[PDB]
Structure 1
Amino acid sequence: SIGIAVILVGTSDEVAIKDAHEKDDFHHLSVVPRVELVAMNETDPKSIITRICDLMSDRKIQGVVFADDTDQEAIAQILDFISAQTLTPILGIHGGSSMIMADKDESSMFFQFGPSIEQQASVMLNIMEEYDWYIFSIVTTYFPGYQDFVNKIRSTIENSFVGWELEEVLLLDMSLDDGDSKIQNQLKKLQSPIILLYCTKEEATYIFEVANSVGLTGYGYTWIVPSLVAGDTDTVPSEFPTGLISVSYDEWDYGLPARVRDGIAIITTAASDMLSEHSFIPEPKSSCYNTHEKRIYQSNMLNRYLINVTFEGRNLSFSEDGYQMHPKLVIILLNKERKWERVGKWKDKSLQMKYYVWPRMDDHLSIVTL
């Protein structure tokens, strides 16, 4: 009899979600969970605070799953703030709540659906050895995770039998005033035909425009960007160079209805296995105000068990940093009419591309030998 809340933002097929909620078989474990579908606008952090406070004070909610449709980044930090301050477990399955943060608080209670920076770098390195692109350079800005990104490649390519060649790393700052001239001047030093970028959408567009002023976005240059650069497939800034390669979370065939059921199953099985063995379950005084003394009962055991679950032949174990540790990834490409096309799929360190040779989009000759 654990109270689980479901939150949707903006327009969504709520009736479809309600219909697909009753699609799991949980009769082999005493859960009898409660489901509460609530919808609200994207007004502000204060509305979010009030919403979770009122819901928790309404009727004994023991867990929350949060969904979203916007591209906001600070919403993940806000939800982590509530997660740390009040011990209720919440999950971020879609939208801006799925964006990765700098780091989780030690006492925080938060898990997200999506790969980390290290896993994304490892994935995008495989794409470069499917096609023998051994010459590349790295350019990035000041973001919570920039060092780890470059450190991952530096650690991976230093001990390899493949011949990796790295040509300089740039750590340009976009917050400087009148530094655009210096940025443009230092962008001319790039010579490798493969460029790796680590930025956010706005400064990604700014950098793309600056580079197009130099002009190295036209024929013999290829750019690879992580998942958060594109962010949402529907809108294109139109200053993105044609032929851009990006990695993204699998959303085409991983419908929102399955995510809610998966999160509910994870929460229910974690609570059940923690309840049965320890003969205990936390049902705190469900009031959002006056939580200074609410820390009487520790709930870290639930946190300790939330990182190892499985159901319906699937692995959903989380990581210590709060990421999925085993996601499903896809590779998208930008074609002439601005749109993202699904090129390849990645799973369990194994890459599976739909092409055998990269299409070119003369002084390129064929050679035959024996």
Structure 2
Amino acid sequence: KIVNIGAVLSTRKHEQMFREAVNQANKRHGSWKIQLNATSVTHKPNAIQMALSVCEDLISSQVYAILVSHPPTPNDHFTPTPVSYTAGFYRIPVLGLTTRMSIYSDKSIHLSFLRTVPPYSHQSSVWFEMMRVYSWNHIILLVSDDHEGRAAQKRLETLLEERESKAEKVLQFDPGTKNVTALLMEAKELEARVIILSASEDDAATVYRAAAMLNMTGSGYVWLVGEREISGNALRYAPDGILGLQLINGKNESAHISDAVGVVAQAVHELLEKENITDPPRGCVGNTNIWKTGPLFKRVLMSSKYADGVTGRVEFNEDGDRKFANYSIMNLQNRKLVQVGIYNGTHVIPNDRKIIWPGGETEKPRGYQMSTRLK
């Protein structure tokens, strides 16, 4: 039988990469049982036009799965949404390979959606692990007010209360907002000397500047950030020594496609060796009923282990997100990022470098100067 899968991509050269990859996947384990195919589209500015183009894509093929990417990012957020609403209506399991917003994890809204890169929320595991290794125990948190920020709060809290540490003075600030020095001053009389930022590339630029007046960037203070917190219009303004971090090979946009078709195909075979798999509905217009076996196909696709992953071992969690990824720590010396370690799945392993803390010192500055004066 002819099994058809489609995808939405950006450049039309990655489309040819995808076709070559599905071919090499055919010649890998294929046989006379069932063959595969491919179909591709490109983005458009008005998302509504994209939803209609996706119904055209869908009427043109009894699609079994979709892939989506957002290489051009005038809106890093609203690019992969319309395909998700348009396909989830029929439980058509859509894979997303490059998008990091945290809203697409709440499964009550997007009925079916998966990923091959963990989101910004899963980031705080390495923060807590660094806290355990280096023995820091009094931390100030600093988070924005939109959902993508609010997630990290709950994450860190549930991760800390398992040991009853209860970090102190979580400060919020509205997004796109200038003049945050009204806030930092409240975090000026506090005992803890290690801040943890999580914001957008437009906001982080501000607070880096707003600190330059308060002069907390000086010696003795140490702080660490997240991926989006550097590498933007903000990195020009960063104070040196901020131990931020990054992904192993994200933004590649080509290695993933070789991974997805590998975990998609290894499932379609594991599925069709079973009961009624009838068909997905051919045509947006003229039908109002869901593919009666969508959930099964997502049920199986959840636990499909994959071995030879160009990115590495790929597997999914209970919500749907690549578990056990790689993060590569950084450190900002003389306005250039230089690696200082590697975060592998569960623990951290540094090597062959001396960390440069912000003030220029060369010894691990512990926080918590116990304030002598008293109120």
Report the TM-score range of the alignment, normalised by the length of the smaller protein.
Answer: 0.7 to 0.9
Q: Cα distance 1:333–1:289, how it changes in 2: closer, same or farther (>3 A)?
A: farther
The 5-angstrom pairing of residues 1-370 of structure 1 reads: 1-10=2-11, 15-24=16-25, 25-27=28-30, 30-38=33-41, 40-71=42-73, 72-94=76-98, 97-101=99-103, 103-105=106-108, 108-116=111-119, 119-144=122-147, 146-160=149-163, 166-174=167-175, 180=180, 182-230=182-230, 233=231, 237-251=235-249, 255-278=252-275, 280-291=276-287, 293-295=288-290, 297-313=292-308, 315-337=313-335, 339-355=336-352, 357-361=354-358
Q: Give the SS at the match of 2:241.
A: coil
> CA deviation digits over 1:315-336, x for unaligned, max 9?
4332232211222322233332
Deviation at 1:76, TM superposition (A): 3.9
Unaligned runs of 5+ in 1: none
> CA deviation digits over 1:283-318, x for unaligned, max 9?
222212344x13262421111111111233564332
> CA deviation digits over 1:164-203, x for unaligned, max 9?
6844221233477x97463244343455332111222222
Q: Percent identity, aligned pairs only?
A: 16
Question: Runs of at least 4 residues of structure 1 off by over 6 A?
Answer: 362-366
TM-score, normalised relative to structure 2: 0.80
Q: Give the SS at the match of 1:283.
A: coil
Which has the larger strand fraction?
Answer: 1
Unaligned runs of 5+ in 2: 364-375
Q: Give the SS at the match of 1:330.
A: strand
Question: In 1, distance between residues paired with 2:13 and 2:290?
Answer: 36
Letter in 2 for 1:210: A
CA RMSD of the aligned region, Å?
3.4
Preserved CA contact (<8 Å) 1:23 1:261: no
Deviation at 1:16, TM superposition (A): 4.7
Could you tell me which residue of structure 1 aligns to residue 369 of structure 2?
A: none
Letter in 2 for 1:229: E
Preserved CA contact (<8 Å) 2:48 2:82: no
Deviation at 1:139, TM superposition (A): 1.1
Q: Give the SS at the match of 2:38.
A: strand
The range that moved more, 256-265 or 348-357, is 348-357
Q: Give the SS at the match of 1:341.
A: coil
Deviation at 1:282, TM superposition (A): 4.6
Preserved CA contact (<8 Å) 1:57 1:286: yes
Deviation at 1:110, TM superposition (A): 0.6
Preserved CA contact (<8 Å) 2:10 2:71: yes
Q: Give the SS at the match of 2:342.
A: strand
Q: Cα distance 1:259–1:365, how it changes in 2: closer, same or farther (>3 A)?
A: closer
How many residues are aligned here? 354
Letter in 2 for 1:7: V
Question: In 2, distance between residues paired with 1:342 and 1:29?
Answer: 49
Preserved CA contact (<8 Å) 2:22 2:36: no
Question: In 1, distance between residues paired with 2:240 and 2:192?
Answer: 18
